[PDB]
């Protein structure tokens, strides 16, 4: 099935399977980060946790969440080396978009760029395939809520309930029958299920300082980085 | 461009795929030549023609100038590149220094170009060799050789190709200084050489002759039977 250097580079097997980027699928589990995303009717929620080695860990560098523009923001998983560079590439694509085009970005074409970028790097195996997973939200008129996730395989897909990571198989499988059905989605309802899906694998109910939770609703379209005060207000609101 | 090592120096004293590419010349057809003060001659065999079609375009001897004759061995592709490259050289030496090309100037180009063609990476050496036959200016003759490493050397007579030691051993009769006192003796010398070299004969034999300023001429399969008649009859005359 392997001829020469095939095992170490990217070509197609007898079945046409890639050997290198399937290692990139297990390249996400470094650090044990789990990011879940629940997009409601008028809102979209992101939830992620962190690991703290000791008290010297800085609270300013805690945030793993990234913000594309004032309207739209991102969340990354896997090795942080590929995530910080791929986010800076999203900064370059968004700044060049507003420059030459001069209007709002659908966030769909940004995910088209990153999907082709990670694919072009998957093409030639002499540069690192960049197996980091790209997850965003979106805000656009007349389309309601927008959430898009650019996978390292080179394609972009995202919807109301979508997530990627190590333990997302369990949680999202529960979110299959849990989300719909008929269930209507408010602000505190989408954030609640964002906690319950974390309570499926973990159920630690730890203080809000550990989670990194973004949320964006459409009243003022600008996304805001959350403060632990309002999450603590939602933590006592989810305890019955 | 394209970076890679063509061949590397082995402690055995020579490269691998270059000096072993001499076998590509060694497996080629038999080719010889004889310089002369009156007429210069050469020869080639193993044409492998179908005899039912037109073989005139597979001819193994071309001319940069009417006074310059190109005799090569090995595969045809690298030979055609040697043709066109030497055509650029003979034409550049036609533009500059209008008089025709000297043999030392064309051998230096062909040999050293192939050498610098073996030097830079991403360039595979030619699998061919060649030997020049013609007449130098002011009536002097010429013959030289070419090497895969691009070294040129002048012999008294040209014996190369398949069975180079066999034809050179047959040159024992060619070592005579009386050869050739006349053009008929020169063609009779090539007749005895072509009969001995190598598998032959009667069809695949291909040659030509040039005398002084007169342009080279390729005889039809008519006088070739006449030279083969008197050469085969000479064995009956030697009894």
């Amino acid at each position: 099935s392997s001829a020469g250097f095939d095992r170490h580079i990217t070509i197609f097997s007898p079945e046409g399977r890639l050997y290198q980027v399937e290692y990139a699928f297990k390249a996400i589990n470094q650090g044990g980060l789990t990011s879940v995303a629940v997009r409601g009717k008028d809102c979209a929620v992101i939830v992620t946790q962190k690991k703290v080695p000791d008290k010297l860990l800085d609270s300013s560098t805690v945030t793993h969440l990234f913000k594309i523009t004032e309207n739209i923001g991102c969340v990354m998983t896997g090795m942080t080396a590929d995530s910080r560079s791929q986010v800076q590439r999203a900064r370059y694509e968004a700044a060049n978009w507003k420059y030459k085009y001069g209007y709002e970005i659908p966030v769909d074409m940004l995910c088209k760029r990153i999907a082709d970028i990670s694919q072009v790097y998957t093409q030639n195996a002499e540069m690192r395939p960049l197996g980091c997973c790209m997850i965003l939200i979106g805000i656009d008129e007349e389309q309601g809520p927008q959430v898009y996730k650019c996978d390292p395989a080179g394609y972009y897909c995202g919807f109301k309930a979508t997530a990627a990571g190590v333990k997302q198989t369990e949680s999202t499988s529960f979110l299959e029958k849990k989300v719909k059905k008929k269930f209507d989605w408010t602000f505190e309802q989408t954030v609640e299920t964002a906690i319950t899906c974390l309570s499926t694998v973990l159920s630690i109910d730890f203080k809000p300082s550990e989670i990194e939770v973004g949320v964006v609703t459409v009243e003022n379209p600008k996304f805001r980085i959350l403060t632990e005060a309002e999450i603590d207000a939602h933590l006592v609101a989810l305890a019955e | 461009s394209y970076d890679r090592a063509i061949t590397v120096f082995s402690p055995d004293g020579h490269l691998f795929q270059v000096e072993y590419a001499q076998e590509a010349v060694k497996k080629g057809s038999t080719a010889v030549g004889v310089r002369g003060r009156d007429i210069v001659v050469l020869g080639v065999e193993k044409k492998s023609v179908a005899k039912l079609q037109d073989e005139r375009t597979v001819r193994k001897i071309c001319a940069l100038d009417d006074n310059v004759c190109m005799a090569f061995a090995g595969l045809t592709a690298d030979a055609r590149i040697v043709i066109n490259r030497a055509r650029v050289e003979c034409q550049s030496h036609r533009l500059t220094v209008e008089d025709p090309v000297t043999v030392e100037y064309i051998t230096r180009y062909i040999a050293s170009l192939k050498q610098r063609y073996t030097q830079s990476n991403g360039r595979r050496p030619f699998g061919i060799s060649a030997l020049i036959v013609g007449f130098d200016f002011d009536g002097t003759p010429r013959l030289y050789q070419t090497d895969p490493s691009g070294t040129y050397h002048a012999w008294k007579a040209n014996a190369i190709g398949r069975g180079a030691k066999s034809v050179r051993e047959f040159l024992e009769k060619n070592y005579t200084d009386e050869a050739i006192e006349t053009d008929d003796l020169t063609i009779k010398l090539v007749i005895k050489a072509l009969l001995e070299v190598v598998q032959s004969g009667g069809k695949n034999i291909e040659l030509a002759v040039m005398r002084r300023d007169q342009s080279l001429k390729i005889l039809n399969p008519e006088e070739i039977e006449k030279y083969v008649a008197e050469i085969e009859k000479e064995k009956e005359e030697n009894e």
Binding site: - | S10, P11, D12, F16
Partner: protein, 86 residues
């Protein structure tokens, strides 16, 4: 460069060395000889000797077949001992 003369003197008392046969003449002509072939190198004189009826051998006899037998057997095989352990 030297010990080949002893590998050519392993044939010293062999045969009867013709008075004009010279070691250094052949010893300087054979790089990377090991001992194997160059023992038969002096031996392949007796090969063509018996074949050509030659009563004893002259150094010119085998060195004709030596430059052959080195090249003829170095055409396909250089026996890259340096490569074996590298």
């Amino acid at each position: 460069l030297e010990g080949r003369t002893h590998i050519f003197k392993i044939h010293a008392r062999s045969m009867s060395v013709e008075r004009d046969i010279r070691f250094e003449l052949l010893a300087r002509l054979c790089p990377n000889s090991t001992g194997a072939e160059i023992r038969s190198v002096c031996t392949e004189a007796g090969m063509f000797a018996i074949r050509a009826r030659r009563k004893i051998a002259t150094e010119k006899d085998f060195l004709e077949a030596v430059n052959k037998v080195i090249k003829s057997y170095a055409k396909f095989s250089a026996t890259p001992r340096y490569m074996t352990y590298n």
